[PDB]
Design a protein around this ligand. Structure first.
Ligand SMILES: Cc1ncc(COP(=O)(O)O)c(/C=N/[C@@H](COP(=O)(O)O)C(=O)O)c1O
Ligand SMILES: Cc1ncc(COP(=O)(O)O)c(/C=N/[C@@H](COP(=O)(O)O)C(=O)O)c1O
Lengths: 366, 365, 365, 365, 365
């Protein structure tokens, strides 16, 4: 029985990628050492981190006026780095935030340590929709505007780029990075933790417009300052060498599988398969997210009713584990069930979940 | 062949790399990779808790000391230790002992968060440790910071300095677990894993549990000691594979005799090279005073104290021809540098010893 | 490393070729090969019944439809369809729609068994589908025949044509189970397995149960639907191994999302190649109208519409160096033809996409 | 341990299955399966040519005969033989020699294309070949048909009959290449390959090259001898894998001594069983007159001429317990039947003979 | 791959054996082997003088001591020590400390040359060192003898016992040059080279120069200290090759850090094994008391203190299967004995440590 890994982050990696890492784990391409032993200042690793940046630029069509850097600290680290580097862009130290789920809320709260944060929309009773941009109250003197493209815990995803009336746009794409093409010119800063969609945990990719450097605060750590790191080509200090090497192998895998354009159509096929089972389930599976904001990456749902049948949800997760389908348990803050369908999750995998969901419904529906 | 004298990231034990390779696709039968593993799983809980217990056992860490695993490397703590501690006393003052390039870098970084005073008079050359008595200590300084092993200049403390009861913060990146350490006398110990205990990506921090909460407002949450300690280093996704790698290297250190056996091997390896430099009749020149000579990093010059560039080039070329990697000195000092961390075996240093002996035998006048 | 763009026989899933190899000497532990298995044994009964069940499941074939497995390939049904159905009405007439080479061959073969009226005027170039509303249908015709996907000219139906209540017959040889089909609207569907759902030697035929018993006297017993449906495809020895191979391919299609997912995967594959042609600025020429372009077979020319023989040879030569087999166009059209059947993965097509993009960038004037 | 006495499909040489298994993913280094191989490729031309040459070599087929490989099995030829040859003379009549189940099936099928006349009186039991002197031959008949070996009743011709110079069509399916054959005496020879030369899916048809061009109008083009001979059996996609398998079995026959050695081996094998029957003192009864006994299929009963069902079941149940498969007689006859085709080794017949001897020793009253 | 745990002769450094091999036919260009070198040549004089200088340098032998190389092994000094020194006092009495089989064998041999008195009561088992204050010393005895490291029983002295001024003779064959030695406090130190400093054939004796000339009349000239020291160990033909071999081992010990490094390596190696024995839950049983445990020879039992014969046999069988040689204990004690001399590297000990850990995990209940 082969394992089906629906991991939410860290998540599943392509099997062929794990085969290459295992192959050259003790003698990387004849150099004689491992990537785990490789000096970050050698020519050998210089090609690895340069090829990784070249892949990020190619796959996302990143314009030449954007800097691509690899930092540590994960996504939650960028929750501090974005205000540290950008909240001083305008004297008021004001920043606008769009809270559509748990991770955009966690980021807005963290930004209050560095400036006056304002949520541009009236609070949502439940993270089940994106507030209409026509209802946003945007500060014209705000340094930037922040929003989260894909909410991992709640399954709410933007399928558009919001109009911030010309403001500096900041976006958190950790749970949908390189699942679809992006017009990078519309953004000021894009960041994404690699552990979810483009590699393994340890490294965070950040795409910064080159004219936004140099507004960092005095309290910004040098290792998180965009100007410092973009000047040293992500090599101000020792970067997560192995995680940048793993990321390049996952990026090379996306390119060989059709790039961002193909990942979007595949993400449609996978998410549709599950969403159709839910909508036709006659209430047996309950996804409260509204259809136009449903995420193609994370599909959280309940069983039985809108509040969730705990016994039925316990049998579901237990029968799914004996079938070697891991990490289907929803986030501990919402409970229920969460199916994550990142790039590495194959169509045959979603089919296994889809068949199990149809067989489980035929067996417990009333 | 291949003998890796890397400064950091450095060589890993060949036994460790073999196990990482064996279970990269199916970690101990669970069915997934550690690269694929979730930090909120019970499987990674065993990994990160086993790594913590090894840090506590091998270093004899008291139970009133938190052990957290952060990101950002060494230079991350250059910003993390002031953000977490410079506000311990209202002055926002800190005493810094600059014995080399890494203590100077941390001293410069701390200037972003308060008043930073360098304790001694500025040295002309990082070749000696300013005697602890000539230290201009501030009684109201929030903490005193020094670097146990200066990787670029080869100046290592073989003692714990006296700071008149101040909380002591030490940077042991390039000598972590190379010798037993009295953790009780320290307030905060940090070390980047890539030099002597793991691979690049994760940093060990040992903090006395009564120094949390003095964090400035601008301290990022992933680097705030109080936050990460209260979440067992799981406030956000930690460098899972790096923590798993370190757990195996710590396991290797334990099986070979712990911190007690590492120190004895550190002396054998370091003295083997130092005997060659001292008996070299001026062919090899190491400027460090013998009492402060590092046992991990040995920088020296060839030909003269200023360095014979043409001679040092044939050295590094012939050394590369013999598959001895990363012997080139740091770019700010030049010359040669031999890094003899835990994974570097006695067999390795003997190869470097026989090579330096013959090279001197063929180029000295 | 080989990328198989074969047009029929075509590529099989690597998963399927592996299980066929493992079980070649001892199928499921019964002691013998499938090649040695008797068509009367209880073991082959499970094989052919499962292969019948999968066809009914993956296409949603209603209960009033028979599913049989014949020999003779697709061209066998060019004679078996008239022999079985041209006598539905006493006139011995049949309406045929000639959109390419394979419907043209079927129309000429049917003239041996009756009077055949082609429903539309000659096209001059197989580049479009004549409008079904302009179709000259005979209300006394026994059936209406049409080829859903023309493997040589790349002309595919993206709809079911209205034949005004006439018994409808379709040649789905080259797009069988590449998309869902409303079987209720058809009278007879047939498809050679060697193009999309297995290996050569067997032909699947789907017949409405009231269309049996209209076969002419001259129809062979092994090709009479009524005879073969009455014996469950076992009137004589069936292609046992070829039916077994089909069952594994169908089981592979079911495990990958059924026909619904094949249609969307075929959209990704064909859109990737067709866009390279449209943006080629005349370097790649596909004369088929976009509304009728095939998602399975993409024939095109290089250089200009009539074809540059020099560029088309280097394309096929460099494609052969890269192990991209069977990309040469059919003998009657020449040029290039890429076949993107079910087993052809997205990763395969990307190798073709990168090669066509690089060839254009290197020879475009 | 399994001993396969299958009637058809039958056992294949273990060395053939071993080679098919190892080349199944990468046939002779070309990079693809034969199941994926195009029938128009250089590789398959070499396969189908080698299969034809071995047929011509082992049977010594004269140059004025076409060797074509068809689909539809032997029952397919039951229609292809009349469709191609019943119009040879204007009367459209054919004379048929019914010696068992497969002659009667073929004679009845032929009645769908012309007037068929059995040349001999209806035999009360298929136990003897009517003396060729008794044959009532029509001098205006288009051909004379007879079955060489009746697989169900065990009646075999050990001579080429005299048909007064008429064109002779023979159904050698169950004794093809079990002995040399004077091909020059025949007009059409056909044989399903699943009994003694390969796997199910392909039929070998040897036609004298002047009998081409007499096919009826209703003959399917895939079954027309003239069409297929002009296309080297490549008018449409042929059963590629079956022909590849058939070639390997032909190579195995050639390496084991050709048709001459098969006749010597088939004599030793059938004698081993008949000797048990002839000396069984009525315990085993074989109704066929010994001068017409088949050397390939040995049907018999246990107990008495009509057969004791209680004893025959215990025989088959114990035989199945010993892993001896397909010993049950045909459904229309019941009882026991042993098929001893070329792949059935001498040790296989030795296991059966030792079992029959012990079974006779345990139940003979 | 072979790991040599021999008790004596033991393993030699792989580098030393390589040099012996390379220059076996042409010792440093001279044109002859060492095996052919005349002991009276200028070439061999350089060799034996080199070996003597290395012994003085590594052990810090004061100038008032003679260093001589003799034949006869260690047992040769069991006779040579009484013959040379028992006449130092007219009583012909000598004190012998019996801690194991080698001091016991040395005490018996000493009775041939005088009245020998064992200083303590016979132990029930050679598991500890009798307390030095419990020693019954003869003030009129010529000398006091003891064995520093008992190879058979694993009892080792970690001190220089106070003999109240008497001249002290010590048997250091099992730990010679495994640690710094205060040579001044002894009268005669001897050690067979075949255990920790070379190959069999030669024995080193360190004699204080004021103790020469007390040899009895029956002392052979080749074994008299005054004779050999008077001819620089060249009274007769000395074991030329065994001295040359020994000189390379000494050169190897010097390049690896002298005796101070051999002391640290012995601590790491012995403790790695002892930690497994103390934590074995009685699975491994070392009978020696912790304060007298040898660091060169570790004897233990498996299963219980008396030893499970079947369990220890499967231990030695899998040890041989893993190419770990000479682990079987001495015949008088049985069980397992692991020898950890200077040439036995840490990797060798780690190999054994992992094997002992896995042998326990698969046999312990
Ligand atoms: C003592 C000490 N402190 C901090 C660091 C850096 O850790 P990082 O901040 O994780 O890179 C290091 C790493 N030493 C390395 C740094 O080299 P680099 O200049 O970064 O290429 C070396 O000596 O070559 C260190 O030795
Ligand atoms: C749509 C459609 N219908 C019928 C056939 C005939 O298959 P067969 O009769 O089994 O060969 C085919 C076979 N097509 C193949 C035929 O190749 P061929 O021209 O036979 O070498 C092709 O397109 O190249 C088909 O594509």
């Amino acid at each position: 029985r082969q394992v089906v890994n629906f991991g939410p982050g860290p998540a599943k990696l392509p099997h062929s990628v794990l085969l290459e890492i295992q192959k050259e784990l003790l003698d990387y391409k004849g150099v004689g050492i491992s990537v785990l032993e490789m000096s970050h200042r050698s020519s050998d690793f210089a090609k690895i981190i340069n090829n990784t940046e070249n892949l990020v630029r190619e796959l996302l069509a990143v314009p030449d006026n954007y800097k691509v850097i690899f930092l540590q600290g994960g996504g939650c680290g960028q929750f501090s780095a974005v205000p540290l580097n950008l909240i001083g862009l305008k004297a008021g130290r004001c920043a606008d935030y769009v809270v559509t789920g748990a991770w955009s809320a966690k980021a807005a709260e963290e930004a209050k340590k560095f400036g006056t944060i304002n949520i541009v929309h009236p609070k949502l009773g439940s993270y089940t929709k994106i507030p209409d941009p026509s209802t946003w109250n945007l500060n014209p003197d705000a340094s930037y505007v922040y929003y989260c493209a894909n909410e991992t815990v709640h399954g709410v995803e933007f399928d558009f780029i919001p109009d911030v009336k010309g403001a500096v746009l900041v976006c958190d794409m950790s749970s949908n990075f390189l699942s679809k093409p992006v017009d990078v010119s519309k953004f000021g800063v894009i960041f994404a933790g690699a552990q979810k969609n483009v590699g393994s945990a340890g490294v965070t990719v950040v795409i910064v417009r080159d004219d936004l450097l140099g507004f960092a605060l005095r309290e910004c750590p040098s290792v998180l300052e965009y100007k410092v790191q973009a000047g040293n080509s992500s090599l101000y200090n020792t970067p997560p060498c192995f995680s940048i090497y793993v990321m390049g192998l996952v990026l090379e895998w996306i390119k060989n599988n059709g790039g961002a354009a193909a990942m979007e159509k595949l993400s449609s096929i996978k998410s549709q398969t599950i969403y159709e089972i839910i909508d036709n389930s006659q209430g047996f599976y309950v996804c409260p997210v509204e259809p136009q904001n449903r995420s193609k990456m994370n599909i959280p749902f309940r069983i039985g009713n809108a509040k969730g049948d705990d016994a039925l949800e316990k049998r579901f997760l237990d029968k799914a584990l004996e079938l070697n389908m891991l990490s289907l348990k929803g986030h501990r803050s919402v409970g229920g069930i969460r199916a994550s369908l990142y790039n590495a999750v194959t169509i045959e995998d979603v089919q296994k979940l889809a068949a199990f969901m149809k067989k489980f419904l035929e067996m417990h529906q009333l």
